[PDB]
Structures are given as structure tokens and as C-alpha cells.
Design an enzyme around this catalytic site. Sequence first.
Site, short mmCIF file in Angstrom:
data_model
loop_
_atom_site.label_atom_id
_atom_site.label_comp_id
_atom_site.label_asym_id
_atom_site.label_seq_id
_atom_site.Cartn_x
_atom_site.Cartn_y
_atom_site.Cartn_z
N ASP B 193 0.62 -1.23 -0.07
CA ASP B 193 -0.15 0.14 -0.16
C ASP B 193 0.72 1.22 -0.26
O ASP B 193 1.22 1.83 1.07
CB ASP B 193 -0.95 0.03 1.26
CG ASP B 193 -1.95 1.18 1.10
OD1 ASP B 193 -1.95 1.98 0.40
OD2 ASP B 193 -2.30 1.28 2.16
N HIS B 349 7.39 3.56 6.17
CA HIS B 349 7.72 3.39 4.76
C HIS B 349 9.11 4.42 4.48
O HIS B 349 9.07 5.33 5.24
CB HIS B 349 6.69 3.73 3.98
CG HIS B 349 5.71 2.87 3.64
ND1 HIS B 349 6.17 1.62 2.50
CD2 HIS B 349 4.69 2.38 3.96
CE1 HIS B 349 5.04 0.96 2.44
NE2 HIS B 349 4.03 1.23 3.41
N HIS B 383 7.23 -2.43 3.91
CA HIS B 383 6.98 -3.63 4.21
C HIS B 383 8.21 -4.39 3.34
O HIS B 383 7.95 -5.29 2.17
CB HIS B 383 5.64 -4.48 3.73
CG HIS B 383 4.54 -3.79 4.40
ND1 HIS B 383 4.11 -4.02 5.89
CD2 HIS B 383 3.52 -3.01 3.89
CE1 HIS B 383 3.26 -3.37 6.21
NE2 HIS B 383 2.75 -2.62 5.15
N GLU B 408 4.54 -8.98 -0.51
CA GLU B 408 3.00 -8.62 -0.27
C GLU B 408 2.20 -8.88 -1.53
O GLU B 408 2.46 -8.40 -2.58
CB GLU B 408 2.79 -7.13 -0.04
CG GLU B 408 1.53 -6.96 0.30
CD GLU B 408 1.08 -5.65 1.14
OE1 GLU B 408 1.77 -5.14 1.73
OE2 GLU B 408 -0.37 -5.40 0.93
N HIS B 410 -1.34 -8.63 -1.44
CA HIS B 410 -2.72 -8.26 -0.93
C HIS B 410 -3.69 -8.40 -2.06
O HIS B 410 -4.85 -8.78 -1.83
CB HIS B 410 -2.56 -6.67 -0.51
CG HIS B 410 -3.42 -6.47 0.45
ND1 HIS B 410 -3.35 -5.45 1.23
CD2 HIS B 410 -4.90 -6.98 0.77
CE1 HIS B 410 -4.23 -5.44 2.10
NE2 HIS B 410 -5.26 -6.22 1.84
N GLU B 453 0.32 -9.19 4.28
CA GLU B 453 -0.85 -9.16 3.51
C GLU B 453 -0.80 -10.13 2.40
O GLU B 453 -0.86 -9.54 1.33
CB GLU B 453 -1.48 -8.05 3.21
CG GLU B 453 -1.72 -7.27 4.51
CD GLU B 453 -2.14 -5.56 4.40
OE1 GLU B 453 -1.64 -5.11 3.66
OE2 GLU B 453 -3.25 -5.42 5.02
N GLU B 529 0.42 -3.79 13.04
CA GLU B 529 -0.37 -2.35 12.92
C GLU B 529 -1.43 -1.95 13.84
O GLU B 529 -2.23 -2.84 14.09
CB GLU B 529 -0.72 -2.33 11.45
CG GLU B 529 0.40 -2.53 10.39
CD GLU B 529 -0.06 -2.90 8.75
OE1 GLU B 529 -1.02 -2.29 8.56
OE2 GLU B 529 0.66 -3.60 8.15
N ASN B 589 -7.08 4.70 -8.44
CA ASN B 589 -6.38 4.83 -7.36
C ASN B 589 -7.03 5.06 -5.97
O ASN B 589 -8.33 4.89 -5.89
CB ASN B 589 -6.02 6.52 -7.56
CG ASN B 589 -6.89 7.55 -7.47
OD1 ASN B 589 -7.34 8.03 -6.28
ND2 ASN B 589 -7.47 7.94 -8.58
N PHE B 593 -5.62 7.80 0.94
CA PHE B 593 -5.06 6.54 1.76
C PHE B 593 -3.62 6.45 1.98
O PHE B 593 -3.30 5.58 2.77
CB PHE B 593 -5.78 5.12 1.72
CG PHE B 593 -7.13 4.99 2.05
CD1 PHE B 593 -8.39 5.37 1.61
CD2 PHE B 593 -7.45 4.61 3.44
CE1 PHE B 593 -9.90 5.35 2.10
CE2 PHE B 593 -8.55 4.38 4.02
CZ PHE B 593 -9.66 4.86 3.48
N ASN B 596 -1.30 8.39 6.11
CA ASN B 596 -1.56 7.71 7.43
C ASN B 596 -0.70 8.04 8.27
O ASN B 596 -0.71 7.29 9.46
CB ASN B 596 -1.78 6.29 7.35
CG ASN B 596 -2.36 5.70 6.11
OD1 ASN B 596 -1.89 4.77 5.58
ND2 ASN B 596 -3.38 6.53 5.46
MG LIG Z 1 -1.84 -4.23 1.64
NA NA Z 2 -2.55 3.67 3.49
#
Ligand SMILES: [Mg+2]
Ligand code: NA
Lengths: 1015, 1015
Positions: B193, B349, B383, B408, B410, B453, B529, B589, B593, B596
Site C-alpha cells: 500500500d 515506509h 513492508h 506482499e 494483497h 498481507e 499495525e 487510485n 489513503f 496515514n
Molecule cells: Mg496491503
Molecule cells: Na495506506
Amino acid sequence: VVLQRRDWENPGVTQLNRLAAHPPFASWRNSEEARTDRPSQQLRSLNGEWRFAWFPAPEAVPESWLECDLPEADTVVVPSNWQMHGYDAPIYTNVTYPITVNPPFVPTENPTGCYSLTFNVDESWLQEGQTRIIFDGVNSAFHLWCNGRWVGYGQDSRLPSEFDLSAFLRAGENRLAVMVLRWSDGSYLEDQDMWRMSGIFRDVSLLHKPTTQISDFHVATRFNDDFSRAVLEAEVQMCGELRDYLRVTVSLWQGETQVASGTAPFGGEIIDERGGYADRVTLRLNVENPKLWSAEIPNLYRAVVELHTADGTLIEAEACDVGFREVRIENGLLLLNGKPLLIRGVNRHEHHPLHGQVMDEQTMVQDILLMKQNNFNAVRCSHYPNHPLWYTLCDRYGLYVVDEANIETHGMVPMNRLTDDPRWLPAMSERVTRMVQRDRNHPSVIIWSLGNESGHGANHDALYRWIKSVDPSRPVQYEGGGADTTATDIICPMYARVDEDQPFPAVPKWSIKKWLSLPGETRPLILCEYAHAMGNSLGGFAKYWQAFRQYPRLQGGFVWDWVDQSLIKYDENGNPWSAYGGDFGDTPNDRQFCMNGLVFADRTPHPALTEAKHQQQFFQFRLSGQTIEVTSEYLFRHSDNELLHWMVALDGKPLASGEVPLDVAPQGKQLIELPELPQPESAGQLWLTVRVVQPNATAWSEAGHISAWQQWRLAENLSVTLPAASHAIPHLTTSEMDFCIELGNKRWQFNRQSGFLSQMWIGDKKQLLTPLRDQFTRAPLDNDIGVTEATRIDPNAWVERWKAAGHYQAEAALLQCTADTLADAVLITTAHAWQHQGKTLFISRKTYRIDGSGQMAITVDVEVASDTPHPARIGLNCQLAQVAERVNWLGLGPQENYPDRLTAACFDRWDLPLSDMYTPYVFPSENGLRCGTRELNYGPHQWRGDFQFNISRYSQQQLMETSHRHLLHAEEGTWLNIDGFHMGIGGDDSWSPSVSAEFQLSAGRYHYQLVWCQK
Amino acid sequence: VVLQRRDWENPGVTQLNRLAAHPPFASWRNSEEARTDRPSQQLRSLNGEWRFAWFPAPEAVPESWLECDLPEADTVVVPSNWQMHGYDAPIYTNVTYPITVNPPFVPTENPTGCYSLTFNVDESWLQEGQTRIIFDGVNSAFHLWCNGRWVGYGQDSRLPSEFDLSAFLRAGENRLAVMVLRWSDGSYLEDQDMWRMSGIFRDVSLLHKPTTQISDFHVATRFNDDFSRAVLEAEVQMCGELRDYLRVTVSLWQGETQVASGTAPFGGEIIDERGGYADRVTLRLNVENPKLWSAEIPNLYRAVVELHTADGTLIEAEACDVGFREVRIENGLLLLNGKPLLIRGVNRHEHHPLHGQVMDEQTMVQDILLMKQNNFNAVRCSHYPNHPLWYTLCDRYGLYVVDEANIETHGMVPMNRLTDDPRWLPAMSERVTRMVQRDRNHPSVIIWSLGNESGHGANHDALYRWIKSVDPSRPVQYEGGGADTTATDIICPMYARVDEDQPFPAVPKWSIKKWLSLPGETRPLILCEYAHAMGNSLGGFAKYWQAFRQYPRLQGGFVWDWVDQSLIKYDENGNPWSAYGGDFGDTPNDRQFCMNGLVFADRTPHPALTEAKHQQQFFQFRLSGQTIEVTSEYLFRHSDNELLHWMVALDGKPLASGEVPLDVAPQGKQLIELPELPQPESAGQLWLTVRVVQPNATAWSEAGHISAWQQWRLAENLSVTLPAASHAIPHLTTSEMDFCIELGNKRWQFNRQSGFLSQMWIGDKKQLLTPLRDQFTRAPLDNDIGVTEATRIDPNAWVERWKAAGHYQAEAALLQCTADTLADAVLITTAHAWQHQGKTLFISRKTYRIDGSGQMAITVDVEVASDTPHPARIGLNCQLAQVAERVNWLGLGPQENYPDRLTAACFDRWDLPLSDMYTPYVFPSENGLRCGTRELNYGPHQWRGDFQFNISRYSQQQLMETSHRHLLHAEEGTWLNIDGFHMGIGGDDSWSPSVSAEFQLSAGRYHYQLVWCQK
Ligand SMILES: [Mg+2]
Ligand code: NA
Ligand SMILES: [Mg+2]
Ligand SMILES: [Mg+2]
Ligand SMILES: [Mg+2]
Ligand SMILES: [Mg+2]
Ligand SMILES: [Mg+2]
Ligand code: NA
Ligand code: NA
Ligand code: NA
Ligand code: NA
Ligand code: NA
Ligand code: NA
Ligand code: NA
């Protein structure tokens, strides 16, 4: 691109464009064909004549070959190993790699086999669906072209490689071109102790599947506590376009009868936050009172998996045999259906003396029948996944299988160099995961193995855990790195001894009894390899089985191994002979080490097979007075095909017999009361023999099959009545050179300079070709020799100890030779010293007493120096003039038996042709001994006493000097060895001394006596 | 070959010709340089300007580019992401893959970055030894050429790919050509993400190693039970020719002091039947009373590994920082050096608003300093493995690190589709194994993670076991498949709530308290998390920390997350603004998000950061009478850089203060007795504030740094004394349209049709721009919005509930508006109903009492229909005509605080510029509230009561209608929101309602009262 990329020197590339592994498919389009396992029109065999050309390297292959047949190519049977057609030599090497150890590189001179096939494909196969080609076995790597276009690449010699040909094929004539490399990076994981061969050596096939297809299915069976209820779970996966009308039906059949059925649309349960598998479904079928699968009773059901439309139109069907069984380890015991197994196993390589490593149904069935007839219940796939038919046969005939990944890196230094290296994890992973994906539905497979002799590396732990996650139904074992690592559910040592520790640094082989109780240890112990059956071997086999029966957590083992890996070669007259390492110009090689079988390569048994059969018996016997107690070692079956025959004999002469039907529950006991027997008048030992006979034929045996036997000594009446005194008296004639005893027509000549009986005369007929002399040596067995070489002596080997001590070179020195007249006999007394470099090894003191009856009583008293290696035997030998057809003896037989391998032998009166008294071990050695012999008859001669003997047309000298049996020549007359005493043969392994202390001739002083007369 | 093989669409090919992974190397040829970690002459940076050309696909790249610079290419900074240079759009997508999900295939339109560099190589580098190139990070796959010749290929965007250039280079000028593919089969394992970018985004370097070299070394530290003795074990591996004269020395240094040293020739212990590693050696060094490493005290030693000859000639040296610490789980607790950790962690990140995913030392240091200053002790590499310098900084500054594999998946359906597939095991294994090989020597790394994930597949189990086998020193964790699978040592859920279960099918998120004690469960629980800090968030943060402190096995968690992933864009004026998903034409998109963070992209703190700092405090406080009890939560350090400042104030007015040195043992207590405090004369509430101050600067903080604080209410003296009655009396003027109240130069106007105070005058100057009206709504926070879209409504989201109920559209209906004259006041009484489609949502009943002093007392009583969704606020709203510079209040501050995020706020007298009363969240929403306010001053106005307020130049309407902060325009005057009551903000997650019941306005009837006057 193909030549440039050198994918065969890259362990990161194990395949290109290869399809996913899966259980055996046939793509039936008829559900009934699937149910009954009939041939499928959708699965076509390409097992025919192919064109073949051999090249020294892939660089030597002409591009024209991709499009057109080579004029120089031959036409050859496929499947085949190209070494078996004489294109290059097969190599027999044990540990040392056949190529320079330089991973991932292989020699630039890399034998390349170019196979091609021109074949027809019908348009109906190409108008719809998917056509794949399946190579069940290609050794060791290959590129594939179809109609001149490159398709893909594959590695791993022992699992199928499949490729989608749908876009490559045309209606009508097609051509496949297969370039097979002898060596690849895959070869580094393929260092098994076996002939190194290559080629397309397993089936090639074409399979048509619909575009919407069953891509995978897994069958699991779970049980309640008493196994009276089961749930069969079948997970089915599809490929193609998902549609709402699609359905999967799983039906379960007991013969003609459908016992359960389930139907569902696709769409599995929710797995995680993203949902579930839209392309999978799991069917669950309840089964009440399932018939359970075991090696004892291989009950099978048939699972049929149908992909169809909601309105009932079949798309395709697949199927498998299902055996309802649970395998689990609980409280340190391996259990099958809740009961602790006793593994009567054997390791079996895929070997044929003519066809090499190509397997056929006939040979497979022959092996399984012979295994079951000899009380084996288990086989280990040493050391690779087998031909797929093998598991089906084991499913149906009933054998427990250890399925083993094609991973062996024995020749690496250290052994885990590759298996601890994460760069080799991808290559290793595929050898494990694709085996599981192929074989997981076979009920005969009860244990997964991670491979063989590859040390212990982190890659093993990873793959151990992978299997445990994907298939919780089977324990995982692996011997490497000391047999009890974290990558094994079962302590699975190779050649660990029963009582003796071998405390090697880092990887000790503890006594198996000791191993179980090491601090913190709780696991079951099943030897992955034990009782190395190389040549005259299996000494001490009974010691293992006594331990297995006494200790609950000793749950057996797999004998090494089933069949000699000898190959057929032909002399100038076209006569076949058995060849081993080195016979093909292959060098370096490990000579006769490829032959470790219980049976010869043609499946003729070695004598050791009977010892295995007897020790692995499923009925145990005790005798208490009049009562025979029979105990069943079966876990599941009642003795419903068993009757006990009993027989009482006095020195071979039958006096009473009878039969009682056996009615013994699994693990139960039956008491059989023998009737009161008459006491025989004459002297001698009464012997009781019992045999368990199967009255009815089975799938694996003929009516009258003997499954078990045992003997006991009963009453003995010692002979006290004196022989009636003969009137005749022998006369002694003395010269400076000889003592001559004459009794009418009979003469005995003793040479006074040598001190031996040099000749015997019956009238004018000479009886001896060589004097009767002491013998302390034997033509060395494979176990005596071990790994010793002329180039590199192993000073620890028995043969080298005997050689170094001068046992083979020792000369007799006469100390005493005297003659005396008694009232009714002549007495000759002799003493000899055997010496080497001034050291006295043995002293033999003898008396020969010849009386009026013409009997010669020989007393022999032997001293053995305590500091000389214990001798192989203490006996006499001579070359007899006579060649007679039959050998008759009262003693242990009928087969060859040795002091540490005689439990299977029975005491009785035996009568065989002379040829049967010789065991044709491919590598010649001392052979054909029979022990516990009280009387021996050959031609005009009778010997009485308590001795061991062998008799043949071959001297010990010739057997010692001849490397191959086919090179032996019958000598004049007959060589007789009569031993008061004979050393064990050993066999716990064949690379270090393995004769147990109680079977070594260490007593220092020895006595035996013989009576030689004319009968 | 390269174009034809398409290695970027094959998960079986993750690299070609790539060298083995290993710990950071520099090949020092001087031991002292190695010891002091000075730059190595053998390690060169290629971080300079390279030539770059962009292409739409690899097929579009000209062959000429291999040999010659493309004239159309640009000179660009490397490392870089080419999106940050404008060559194509960065893409922000959360879960859904940015490419069609069709593994292993990627789009034919595959953006290709062609990088090249002309650079010089010293003759000496080519005359001997090995020259390698190191790409620390290339996203996502690349082929490499040197001087026109193909070298190799690499995947995995987050680990170094290294290639041997020795055979490719010439002395002087050389040219590298690097073709970087945006999309590859690797992209399927890189669905984090975050912004989807590409390029050579980490360091490029050249390393010269001698031919005989250290190829790997592992450092381990084992301890006795009380950590007073340690053994440092160093396993060292070589490549090159082995010689008997070769030696390895390992020396350990504590500053300038050599603590221990050991030397040995090569040749490891026997490993198995084939021996040991001739090319390895293990050194064991004893260390008495080692200085232990922790986040509290990051004691480090230096280990120097010297490869040399017996005569003492150095061949090369490598080195690393060593931290003596033990990480283990025992009795359900994660322990460091035998003590139970409390993880004050954050996910971080690698993000820079200008440079994208390129990390630099300054930004890393800035992050670490801000983390430690805000009481964080731990970081999760979400990640993927980080830039190598990150671990060095964490080693040296002291942060606990979770190192996480770049895996990942996801967006797969289901999530484990790839991770359960053995075809993907090779690609996954390399992402895990190469991480461990690189980072295993860093003390800061305490936990390994298998990725993020990706559901739970059998590949996770395999790799879990692989890590446990190769590195038993660190726990392994993994959240996928429900956070408590067999692939995790730590229950590590994401966004599991404190008390509330979220019982999702298959993958439930239990209350963390309940999770610990589930039947059979024994593991520690650390949230990987939690507390999703998206926009105005961290409501309920205190609830987690209370639970972490109460429950031993709740050992903390990692906040999501550190820094907003906003990117800088420029508008017409060239002015930079903060951009999120969609702002680059990227579609689909996930909009805001990507933001964060606890801090803005430029590292300016969000208000939530202070709530985190406060809750993560290392000192706990209790008050009993005059006694302050201070408890230390440190495990290792004494409070040797701490004093306690205390202050007692009456309604913000200081009365007494003092300082006390802190002398608290780790886990200890100290009792501080406050002196006798003088009783205050005037009315009001006494407040005690304590602060822990660090007098001395550290490596991570300035002198005077405040590390902890707490407040208590002490004595309160309620005001009983009547205000002196003012002689002035207000007059009511009544008309049809209006009630007017006059008192000297002041007028209040109540509109009789609307029923609201429409205007107030001080002389002739208007005070209001909009009437004073009730307000029941707020400009929705990110937490109110969740995942709802105009095209796909989430009916469960708070904003959608308020919208559907008509809260935003409800119109005030006047029920009652009356005016009365009292003895000394005018009384205005109003009642309003808010209705939507015939439904009465809210009723507001008010009295306004204006007395002779010019004070207006407003009493508000609100009814809320029990069946309408609970309102966001209950308050009053108006636009003031005045714009004043300062805002002064007596209440909680100084920063923004909300009812479920106010623990960090302190009660005192606060004075800030108006601009500080607005929080510039990139996505605008209700912001800047201050709670527990008793008095508010702005210009000539004063409001008294017990209320919450915000004050800014932006209406709630504009905030709600404006998607980006840069588009906000200050309105005329000042908008004031004064709330009797305000709903919590939530934030346990930001995709479902997360406001706890106790912070929802569910009481049905509400009362509040204010006094508005002129100070
Ligand atoms: Mg994810
Ligand atoms: Na996010
Ligand atoms: Mg390869
Ligand atoms: Mg081997
Ligand atoms: Mg017996
Ligand atoms: Mg690839
Ligand atoms: Mg507080
Ligand atoms: Na047993
Ligand atoms: Na062998
Ligand atoms: Na029976
Ligand atoms: Na021989
Ligand atoms: Na805790
Ligand atoms: Na202090
Ligand atoms: Na907004």
C-alpha cells in the site's frame, strides 16, 4: 538462445514452460471407464520406435535435426537407456560423482541423446481442448521441440515433465525432437549409489484434456476413534472458464456399489480477507464402517471425480483408488489404523539387467509377489520417485511405501554443501513438492522422505515443514545429518547396529536400543537401511528381529537391498554374463558394490532371502512340554488362510505328523496340544518341525504356500550300546617316507615328511587328488574385503588382517608324526605348526584311529595364537577324486547357511545335486557352507561328527583368485571343506568389520572330531 | 536472447549471474580503517549523474543504446525514481494491483528506463582481484550490460543485486547500460500500500575484493543466565584458493580498547560423514561483563574480521557493529536481555515528498531523532528490507527493528493464491533468504517478518522454518491468515481493537485482551499495525496503552504509520502543494489513503504525535496526598538524565513550582513529597503539572527535552460570592421582524422569523457575518468517510449515515421565539426543530439572558431522536466579523485535542496565533478543536462555560467541499464553532466505524451553557 543460455548449468532453471504437477490423469469422457479404470482414448502412448542419434556434446548437434531426420540416426525402442543400446558406457560409481565436482558446471563433453518421432495427430484433438505431452522420466535434462519450434525444458530424472503442445501441433504429420543431456546441474542432486545412465527411460504419452478441466484433486480420509466412521474429503481444482452451471461430483464405489456421492458448484469456503478459491471445491462424503486399507488386507474403494454441467452433461472424469487408512505417530509409535506397525521392509532400486533403469509391469509384479511371499510388508523407493505404476501395484497388492524425493548429494564435501545453500533450495523444493503433488492420493504411500545422503541443511528443514503443512496425513523422514535431526519424524539410521555403538564424530550411529532412550528422545526408530546383503551376507539378521520384537519403539527397517544391480554382457559365443562396476571401461568405479541384493538381477533368490523370510514371519511359536503356543503378529487379519503342519522325526526319519487349523485373532494366541508320541527304540535326537501353510491361493501366493516355520529339539536318547567288535585288524607297514595302513582291500597312506594323509585306496582306485590338510582361511567374502583396494589397502578389513598376518601364506611345519599299533586299530599321531616369518600362527595336533570296521576316527586339537587375527575357519580340506551327482546330509539345510545366518535352516536329512551345493554369487567367495551337520554322504564316502561343510568343483584358491563367476572352471574331482568351526559372515555393513564377537574364532583352543568311512 | 526469453514474465527466473547475498562489505586493506569504520578505497560510489531515456516497452529500446549514448537521453541524478523526474505517472493504489492480475504476465506496455553511465576504473582494480557492481535497489527488474556485453539480470526491488564485472571492464573509461522494467513477475510480490514507482532508487557502487576473500561472516552472541559473561562466535567463510598459510583473526573492540581476539587457520569442525567445511572457520571469543545493547542504551562493540597470512600480511578486512543482546520468547513473553519488552513502535515506509522512494542519511536521522524524541523505541520496516544505512543508524541510536521480507500479494484472490503455490516458492524464498543473509549481523534487528498481507500459504511455513533453522537468535513473525498461524512466534494482528471483537469469517480480529487467553494460546501479542493515523485520528490511543500496561503478554505494537505518503506537485505559480492518489492522472487510485502518518511528508508533526509521545512515556505517575510516586518503565537504565519539574496553578495562574532530581532504578519507584502549598484566596481549580526534563543533551535530544508529563486536579474552591449588581438595565425594543436589546453602545438583534441572534453591535461596528445557529454536523474526518465513494456508497460509514439521515441538509423550523423583561435583564426564549422529510432529528431549546453588565448567558437544551445516527457535535456556530491575531484560552492545549484524543493535552492558559488553531491536514476536515475549555478570548469577545471549540478562517462547508488544503481560501472574518459536546474521532482503523460507544453522542438529551461578553 538454447545453446547460449546453457540452462543445464543453472540450478535456478529447472524447467521452462513445464506444466504443474498433479496426480495421474486420463481425462476420461465416460464415467464408467473412470470407475473401472479402463484405458482412455484421451491418453495415448508414444512408447514405440523413435529415431535416435548420439552426440558428444550439445554443440555437436546439427540445426537440421530440428526439422529433418538425420540419415545417420538409428531406430530404437523407447523407453530406453541409451547405454543399454551400446552408445556409451554406463558408469558404476557409489559416492564419488561421475563428473568433476564444480557446481553448477558439467563437463563440456556432455553425451547428448537426440530422440525424434514422426507421429500422426487427429484434427479432433486440435479443434478443441488441450493436448499435452508427458515425459514420465528423462535422465537427466532435456529440451523439447515440436515441428521445429522450441517448446520447453525439464530437469529431475524421476518425475514427469509435461508440456502443452496445443499451439505447436498440426493435423496430420508431426515431429518431436528431444535433446537429452547426460549431465546437468540436476546431476548434482542425483548422486545415488547406482549405475549412471541416461535417456528417455520412462513412458512418453499424449493426454487430451478439455479446455475446462480438472487440474488437481486431493483425497483425504479422517476417522473417529475406533475407525467405525470415516469422512472422505476430496478437494477438486479446475482450470478454464468458470461458469455458474459447472459442477463437481465425487462418488465413492465399493466394487459395483456406490456407497457415497456428493455434488457441488465451484467456490470454496472463505480462506482470508480476500475471500476463497472460486476455482476449487471440497466435497465431504460420510462412510460408515469403512473397509480399512493395510498391507495385510489391501481393501480399496474407487473415487470418481466428475466435472459436469448442472443439467448432467459430463465434461471429463478422473479417478483414483482410495485406501481408508490413518497414519500417525503417537506416544513414540508409528501407528497404522491405531495399531503399531512392524516394518518388514526392503529398499528397492529400479533395475533390470537387460533394460537398465527402464521398468516394466511384469518385473514390478514379479518383485512384489516375491517380496510378499518372503514376508515383506514394506518398500522404500530408494532413492527417487518410482515409475507411477509401482504405487498402483503397492495399493492393490498391499505394501507400505516410503516415497522419496530424487535428492542425493552424497559426493559433496561436506555432504550438506548444497542442501544448506539457499541457492539450491528452488531446485530441491521442486524435487519434493512435485513428488507430493503426484503421489499424495496413493494409500500405499505412508511416509514421505526428503531424499538420501545429502547431509542436513536448512533446505531440508524448510521442505520438511512444507510437507507437514500440505499433507498432515503422513510422517516425514530423512536420514541425513545423523538420522535424528529436526527434519525427521522417525529416527531412521542406516546400518546402525543392534548392540554396538559406532560413535563417529558429528553423525554417530548409536546402537538402535541405546538410540531410543537418549536423553529427551521420544521418536520411533525404523532403520531406513540395514543388513547390507552384499554377496554372502545377512549375518546377524536374527539379532535385529529379536530387538524389533522386544522393543516397542524399534519398529523395523528396510533391508539394503532388494535386487543386485548387475548388468548383462556377452562373451564371444553370445553367452550372457553378469557384470558389475568397471566391466564397461567405466573408471573410476566401485566394482561389485552395485550388487547388494537379496535376489540376483534376474530375480533368482540369494540364500539370504530365506533368512529374511524366516525372521520376518508373522507367527511366533513357543513350546512348553506338549503345548505349542502360536502367537499372531498380524494387526488386522485373523488367520483365515492358515493351517499348522507339525512333524516329529528321529535323525530325519519321520515318526509322527499331523495338522491343526489355525484360528488366531490379530495379536492373539492359540494353544495346540500335541498328542503323546511313542518313544523310539533307537538312539538319536528327536526334532519337532512346525510349518504354517496357506491352503488357499491368494493374489500374491499359490495354494500350499509356506509362510512360517520353527524347530525344537525334543527328547534325545544317547547311544550307549557298544558297536559289535569287528574281527578284522588293520596292519601297519612302515617305510622311511610313509605309514601305510591296510585293511584287506583298503589302504591309508600317511606321508612322513609332510605328516598328512596323502592318499586313500579302495582297491586300485585312488580316492584323493590332494592330501587332507588343515585349512584356516576362506576365499574372502564381500564383507571380509570391505572397501580395501590393491591401490589403497584398508588395514582394518578382515582380509587385510589375514593377509598381513600371513594366514594365506602360512606353511605347515611337521613337529611330530608317529604310528602305533593297538589291539584292534592303528593309531597315527601328528603335530604341525603353521608359521609366518618365524611367528607361529596355529598348531594342529591330530590323531587318526583306523579300526577293523574300516572307520577312520580323526581327532583335531588346534591352538591359535592369541595375537593373530581370529582365523576364518578351523577345518580340513582335500580334493576328492570322485565326482558324484548327489550330496546327502543330516544337518542344517537345504540352503547355504553360516553360523550367524542359520536360523532359517532346518535340521533334517537333505539330498541335493552337487550344483546346488554351490552358490553362484557374481563375485566369487567362500560359499555353500552348511552348518550343524552330523553326517555327510558323497559318492563312496561318509563323514560323521558335528561339523560345517561345503563341497564343490571349485577350490578356495580359485574362488579367491576369480573376480567373476562366469570365469570359474570346474576342477578335477571335488573340493571338500570340513570345518569344526567357521567364522560369521557379518553384514551389518560391508565397508567395516561387522562379524559380531560371539561369531569370531577367538577361543584360542579348538577341538573337533570326525569319522571318515566308506559307505 | 534477452528480448526472446522474457525473464521478467517468469517467476522461475529471479536473477541471472547474480552473486550470493552477504552482510555489508567494504574490503578494507587496512585493519585500523575497518575498526574505525572509515571510508574504504575499495568501495566506490556511482551515485552521480547518469544518462536516462524512457521507453514505453522493452521492445522499443534501440540496439545502439548498448554501445552508444542516446543523444535524446537526459542527464539525471541517480539514485532516483523516474516518476519524480516526470517521465511517467506514479500510481497510488492500495490493494488492487496497478496491472491486470494475470500472473506471471505483465502488460505489453511496460515502462522501461534506460540508464547508462560512462565512468573510469583504476588500472589497479583490474590488475588483481574482483570488481563487482552493487545495485542496492532497482524497481522492479533489470538487465545489465557493461561495454556492450550482457552481464546479468535481477529482481526484488528492495535488496542489493551484485554482479562480477572483472571480465567486462577495461582500464579507464567504461560504459554501463541498465534496462529497468517497471513491471515484472516480481511485481506480483510487491503489492504494498504505497506509490508505485520505478527506477534505480538506491545506491549504486563498485566493490573491489581480492581473489582470496571473505565471502560471508556471521556474528552471534550467547550469554550466561545473568548476562555477566558472553561468547561471541564468528563464522567466517572464504572464496578463492585455500592455502595452509591463510588465517582469520577476529578482534573485538570496545571503543579504542581491544577486548578479545582469536586467530585460526581455515577448516571447520566435522559436519557429517564427508567431513567439514575446509573453506570456513568459526572463532569463539570470551567476553566478561559485556556492555549490553538495548534501545535504552545502544552499547556497541566493533568486530573486525581479518583475512591474512601466517607471516602477518593482511589480505583484506571486513567489520561490523556488534550489539550484545539476547532476544527470546519464554513463558509467553518477548524478552530482551531477560526482560519483557514494551514495544512503542511505528511502521515506517521509505518516503520522501520530493525524491519519492529514494532515502538519504539526513532524512533517516531526522526520522530516528523525531521517533526517539516522541518515546518510540521500535520500528517495523513496512513492508520490505530498508536502505542498508537504516540498520546502522538503528544500531547506533537504539531502535528495535522488525526486518520484513519484500513479499506482499494483497490484491490476489484469495490472498494466499501465490503463497500457497509451490511454483512461487523459489521467488518467495529469495526474498526471505537474501534478507536474512544481508541483515543478520545487525543488533537492531530483533524480529524477522515473512512479509505482509499475503494470506497464509505453505510457502510461509517453509520459510518460517528456514529462518528458525539458520537463525535461532530472533523470533519470526507474520500477520497473514489471521495473525496467529503456525508461521508466527508472535500474535501480530493488524487493527485488532482493545475490547471489541471483530469476528470476520476465517480471519477474525479478536479483542487483543481476549486473543491472549483463547484456549491453548500462549504467545505474546504485539500488533504489527494499530492506531491508523489517517488525517484527524488516533482517537482511543490511550485505551491501547492502558491495556499494554495492564497485561504482561500485551507487549505493544507498531502504529500505522510514521509519515504521510504525499508527493509534491506544482501549480501555475510554481508553488508546491501536497498531492495524493489520483493527482497524477493515476487511475484506479485510492486517493488520500496514502496519507496515514503521524508526521506530514516534510516531517512536521500532526497533533496526534503528541498523543503518542504522552501515552508512550517511560515514567508513570501517581498522586496520594502530598506524595508523587514516580515509576520507571525502563528495563536497563537508571534515570541518570532526568529531573522532575512540578507546578501548581490556579486557573492558569502560577502559585508554586519546584524541581526534584529523579533517581529511579529501572522498574523502580521514587516518592516525592511536595512542600506545604499555600491555600489560594480566590475561587477556582488548582492544577498540579509535573514534567520530566532531560537537563543534558544526548545523541537524539537537546538539553531541556521534555520526556514525560502528567496533571492532576488538586483543591477546588467553588465561587459563592455574588457579582456586584450593575446599575445599568437593558432595554427591549420589539418589532414584527426583530427583538432588539440595547445597553449603551451595545446591541443584540434576534430575528423573529429565524429565531436566531442575527447581529450584535459594539457601537456602529457589526460583530457577526452569519447568525449564531445550532450545528450538529462536522466536515467529515477521514475516519468518518472510510472507504465510501460517490460511485460506491458504504452505508455503514459515519458520513453516509449522517447524509442518509439528512443531518447535512436539515432545516431549522422555528417553534417558539419570545422575549420577556426581568428585574435586571432581558430574556429571549427560542425553540427550533430540525427536520428531514417529515422526521424531527433534533430539537433545540434556548434561553438568552442579557443583563446590565452586557453579559449574554445562553442556555441550550437539545433533544436528539434516539433513532437518528448519533450526531458529530452539539454546538453553536457563527462567522465573526473580526479577524484577530491571537487566540487565548483557559482549557486543554496547546495542540488540537478531541474527546478520545486529549490525554496529552494539558489544562492551562494558552495563547497562540490564529493560524496555529487550524491543523493543515492535506485532506481538509473538521480540525483544530480544543476541549475542556472554561474561557475563550478572541478580539473583544470572551466566552465562558465548559465547552469545546475551534476557530479558523474556514467554514465547515468549505472544509467539507474542498479535497486539498492548498485550495482552501480564508473567508471574510472568523468562523467559530463552540460545542457543548463533540463526537470522538476514532481511528482503530479508517475503513469501518471506529468511534467507541463512550465517545458517541447517544445520550438523547444534552445540556450546555455559555456566557458571551466583552473583555
Ligand atoms: Mg496491503
Ligand atoms: Na495506506
Ligand atoms: Mg538448470
Ligand atoms: Mg549414497
Ligand atoms: Mg530356529
Ligand atoms: Mg522473472
Ligand atoms: Mg493525564
Ligand atoms: Na518393536
Ligand atoms: Na551399493
Ligand atoms: Na485358518
Ligand atoms: Na573372488
Ligand atoms: Na504488557
Ligand atoms: Na537524574
Ligand atoms: Na474535505
